[model samples]
Target: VVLKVFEGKPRINSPHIIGNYPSTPFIFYIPTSGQRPMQWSAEKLPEGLELDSKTGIISGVMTSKGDYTVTLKAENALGVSVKQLVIRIGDELLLTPPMGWNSWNTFGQHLTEELVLQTADAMITNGMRDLGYSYINIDDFWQLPERGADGHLQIDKTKFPRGIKYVADYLHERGFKLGIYSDAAEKTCGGVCGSYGYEETDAKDFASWGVDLLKYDYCNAPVDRVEAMERYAKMGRALRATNRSIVYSVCEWGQREPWKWAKQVGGHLWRVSGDIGDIWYRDGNRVGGLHGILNILEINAPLSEYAGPSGWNDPDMLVVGIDGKSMEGCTQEQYKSHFSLWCMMASPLLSGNDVRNMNDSTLKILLDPDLIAINQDVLGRQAERSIRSDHYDIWVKPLADGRKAVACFNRASSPQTVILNENTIADLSFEQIYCLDNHLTKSGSDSKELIVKLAPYQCKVYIFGKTD
Candidate 1:
């Protein structure tokens, strides 16, 4: 018997919010809907705040600077639903990394409005939003094949008949932000209407439609680096002019060292490598899987100083569950390693799979809150290669509270024993005696030296925090 999951109602879809303090003055209506007139309540709402029981709206000024948890309760005639809102009253948006799902790797150019809505529904129902997987981005092909008379990109009538505005409103009402895609050249990667000549107009239109993110790809654009930079800059300026805090993702395929000047051109995250296909090994012409990931890491190693706060180095969308379908599948261990390395490196966790149809292992790897926490560390510091060898590679990132996130990769075809020596780690003291426990297994040693036997093509990731 096949078990089909029903789209349950009243699932709290509020995004994990990040706000500034002192003058933040934040207001977010508890997006509770199911049976009408739902009641609402919250606990310890950021000091100077109040939640209206009837309207389910929380509003007030934020006076403090810290992480806050607003446990919300909503009830209607049907039933009650409880959700905890993880809010960081901080200084900037995307303080850590953007965690979400995109519809490119799975649906590709066949993306539609209903598919996007269903994916959003599945994200909430599948417990993704609770773990901080928020944005549901619609990649290419959502736009018309050609620009309109006014040179504005139009939503494809057949796929999104209700229009992009309707889709954006639908996502916002469900407590999820909507992200759209366009190109810096004359055409998108999928050959749709690009934003090359209509940066300002497109930006204004997207903002008007309540777009929370814009992924600007580089396709059919100029080969000259200076021209590419100008194109991206124009779009970036236009997006900021709209006064909307839309995440600006620059997808230039790392051709001209975007990490060097992506922030200056108004990018929150820039791709550090080519597209990641669905594969485990890097064959001659294939640029996906473990090999692709390694190359990206190498490219990103020297670009660590470029990543922090609102700026990040994207290693491309995740290819975790992209296995078993149109692409060669990866072993469970490889997928685990991929996720662990990505988190430790502080890469954007844009899941590129059919999230609505996730398997048990995929769900386990994607929804691990501990690993997600490492990626979302408040420090916003990207990891670096602490040690590298022919068969083993070690990475470490410092946390906001002085803890260290570490991952040891066995980049070989056989099992390897990797050890973490405190002496080799800078500023680490063995006298203190701390434990570096694996986030997945919760198993490790509390000594100056850590040892682990990793399987072939696997990684051993751990968090080393002070004991006392």
Candidate 2:
């Protein structure tokens, strides 16, 4: 009753894609087993593209322009095997915030690369363009049982029908960064692959494949705290050896509070909060996204030193558009507040929502240029929770442009009006306010500190500049 196949071996039939440009064939490995010939189906195949499960031949002309999430599902007496693939088309690269959607919290092992890419497409059409969110990040399970006999780390072919490099290049041409998840431990979330012994090789392989980001997890990497730190540091060193600037995001889930060692290990970002959910019993009708939940912010605030222009303390992947519970439920205020807070927190803006279709309200909340500006500011200083409280307060951030970006937030059920006076504006020696260049539509007074009223779970951002 034990059905064993090639496990995770993926081979691209046509190797001519290396330098052939757009002529690249969609590469994916077929089961290649004579036993289960027609076990795979790429149901929602991209236009002009088809999957030949029996021969593992994936060929076609991808004329589309947006990122497409292709899913491959296999079934037989052995059960069901599903894998999601993201095909990014076009040419606009993401230089900051490492855009794209992550499904670790929502899908976990249930996530398919196809589902991730589907979410990517949804993001693009929804408003990822306006906010500059375009990296198709695979949080984990994209690994193989072992490196190639030639020492090159291999991708899990079963999961990736089109080859890894092909996927990476497809994203590259469309200006999207390809992100792969790994761990310093011996095994990732799935018993697939880890960088425990192949740090250097995997780093080089990822770089060779044109990967833009690497999220290193700490699931089963090491036992000793210091040793665990070394494990990640080793991969960081390996990544550098590749002569590439791939973003390194640590997902140890607060193991040892990465803040203390992320910088030392050369990490660009680390998860500081527990996974975010759409709603919670503790707080009825909780804002599914990361922003409104102040409890998570408190735990992540102290990890500021670990964040910089490039490095950040990740609260977790955004579940704004995802979460069946999030559909049509989160008010415009809830979505807006989530977007605003993440920007001011200097957190990675990874979205985890369906992308194929987005409502106007969702798009607006995700595409606010003013908010994006703060997250992409050059200074990269992490947001400091200057103001504190049990239910309501303001979070102020010093942008790289000398202009201060402030968020007046309310987490209570009832609408609350907050004044940016002595309590919230004392540390800031402000004289004139510039209305912050936001879309709050509310006007503030021309006093030392401006004042504005916020709605329930409301968030308002403003830019405070010095006057000559």
Candidate 3:
């Protein structure tokens, strides 16, 4: 069989970089048939450019800064194909991690246009927008049946009688971002309408409504691997054609590992795990959610070459104050763990609790200014679990400011001590560690390490900087 030439624009637009060298690498993603028959060769790849024929990976340091075009050819026994790829190299990185609010976990099918606007207003009023939580996301069940039949995404007329444009405008006026959800499958998680077969019309309507983000969920949809990606790509293509700066969020629930092809199709963020609910238990899935996050973190290392300033690996939303079965709430320890891990991993801080009625404990955990700083740090790097003790986890995030935000996690059934040695700690020069527990006197001694005693299931974030 003759390999079909990889489709889409040869010339792609990279998110405009803002400043100096140490620039973002130019990535040329050539989507293949993933079937046999097509082959590609880059004859004009610039100096230091590298290509992976087996994987169609073309990566390298572009010495110059400007727009450059290269010719590539794909051939097989049946035929040969040629295309010119034009790449615009930018200097600085943009969009390291996304900050937003999603409605699925807390509001679910009850989300309406009024509530969405109220949430947007609340986001600004509650200081979430300035803290990097900008996107006001409308989750599942925001649609109607045969919404697909008319080639128009129908807003639940009863809930959003004023329609999507009004909500989008309200968010825009508030200096916030707007995100709408759809599913790759025929039915959304609510068994309502979705964007499965209406990629083009939906994309157009969304753009018209001034949507800043599109979250494509994976629910009640086709599970065929290739088909899933193709469907996502089709939506991406339709969205792109509109010339709007809409960010794509692929909520595949980490099912097919869409991270591999996420960026190629303009995906800004993709879920790498299942939905994380509000819970705290040591049994199976009690720890299952955190474990799943760690699995995604590991898988993301090799794919680190793929993630950068804008694109990110999502482990799901924050289950801040919500208790699994009761309004009683997840234990304070569990909430701290949830907040600490989410910050370290640099996941979006989309709160999954009733924002208006948040209690002091939940508020304290979620709004700790220090922890929020570490999470929204401009560096945009995700921390890896470098060291693990029997009852503790040591996670260190590298920041662009030349400092490391470390989370000394306590996973013991009871209180325990976390010792940071030379290998785990970045520097001894900075002899002080200001912990997220809001304790400033817990300074490091001449020993160059930090020793802290944490309560059962408690975690602390420390800013390790120079001692000057």
Candidate 4:
């Protein structure tokens, strides 16, 4: 009998990935076939990065913005294979839910370019930029009533003064991304010129103006899914064709369930529900009103699968710090809970409030790094409703680092207590010494059973980590 030797040459998979600049950690595991344990080498790894030879893990803090080509090689007993890939890094477009300030909630259609520029400056001076809020979005009313001879939308010169390109350059110089809004129709929700028939021209103009984000809204148009998908896709294709990466936010207000196809239409994030008002609840007398924070959360709960690194289900903007609108504002406690829940749900933290004048409580909630960390977790997993009862909801998000973030929420008018035993947390192990730490208060507990007391309409979040 003759013995035959079987050996297979290594093949490299996972040839492309993306990263963000200025210390956003990038990680991608290289996949190889026809080998059990293959040695890996990279001909050109980006600065401040490393590749694990045994695991083929390319990970490090990306320190700059550019396109890097890395020729990766995988070698086994049979032979070696090489793959060249591109790692495109940019000014941190929706790597996580975008943290920023938008003009619509506070100023509505009354926004001006000065207000947008001032907010960008305020974001730097007020520590919002340092806390990861970088986008200064000008929502609606930024354009004029008519398009140019070239079919390009023009800025409302009266409000913008220095022009849209100037605003974009100003924000870019200050390390902030400029976000502009348009509609899928001939007119915006506020009845200004929209991108209805000028998708390519508008997208090219946006790129030329250095606009980094586009909030394309659905209004003043016929309500149909075919039109919605076509218009959004057309714009998406146009934006990509410009050779610039622009974060596309689909603001169709959950009509036709944008989550089902938003990414296909080139949206980085899509609104999962109706607009959120300043109040926490609607009065019984209203007929078809905007959603409160709780209502938004409930709506977003079922759409978790649609959210991830580049795509998110926006429950709408943060109403925190907004005061005296058509709907009444929430208390500080309620506002904190709203922020906490939004961060946990992995929604974009676009401040609808005037951040230039936010109080300490509002700043504290918005700037909480611990809370923000959960939202920006590379895992990109939205917390699920682990347990629910009358006036109570318990949500649990599994962290990539083998920890669990749990939230106990009380919706009733009175304070309430929730008990979570091993039965409630089936995955929690008793063999390991697990500790629960409150993210907000820094409270800690180490026991098999955990108890949380939440005030009315409040959320008590705890990070459960293993100690033993």
Highest lDDT: which candidate? 4
Q: RMSDs, each prediction? A: 5.9, 15.0, 16.2, 12.9
Q: lDDT for model 1, on a 0 to 1 scale?
A: 0.75
Higher-ranked by lDDT: 3 or 4:
4
User: Could you tell me the lDDT of residue 174 within candidate 4?
Assistant: 57
Candidate 4 Cα misplacement greater than 4 A, ranges: 1-93, 283-286, 325-327, 429-446
What digit string (tens of lDDT, one per residue) describes model 1 on residues 66-96?
7787788877666787877766765455766
The sequence of per-residue lDDT tens digits that candidate 4 reaches over residues 1-468 is 211111267755322344454454454555455434568899889887888887566766676778788899888888898877667786535656788888877677677877887788777656576456767888888887777776778887889888888988777655577888999999888877899888888998888887878999998887989989999999988887775567899998888899899987788999887788888886312456588877787788877777887888998888887765531579887888899889888888898888878776778787765677688776678888777789889888877678787878888889999987788865854333332233232224456676677788888777766632
What TM-score fits each model? 0.82, 0.70, 0.73, 0.79
Index of the highest-TM-score prediction: 1
> What's the number of clashes in each of the models?
0, 20, 3, 0
- Cα distance off (Å), candidate 2, residue 291: 12
* lDDT tens digits by residue: candidate 2, 324-394: 44432355676677778888877788876655566656666666656776776655666777767665767
- Candidate 3 — which residues are off by over 4 angstroms? 1-94, 281-306, 325-329, 425-432, 439-445
In the range 317-340, model 3's lDDT, one tens digit per residue, is 777777663234467787778788
lDDT of each: 0.75, 0.62, 0.65, 0.76
Residue 325 CA displacement from its true place in model 4, Å? 4.8
Instruction: Give candidate 2 regions above 4 Å deviation.
Output: 1-96, 103-124, 144-154, 280-292, 323-331, 427-431, 436-446
CA shift of 28, model 2, Å: 27
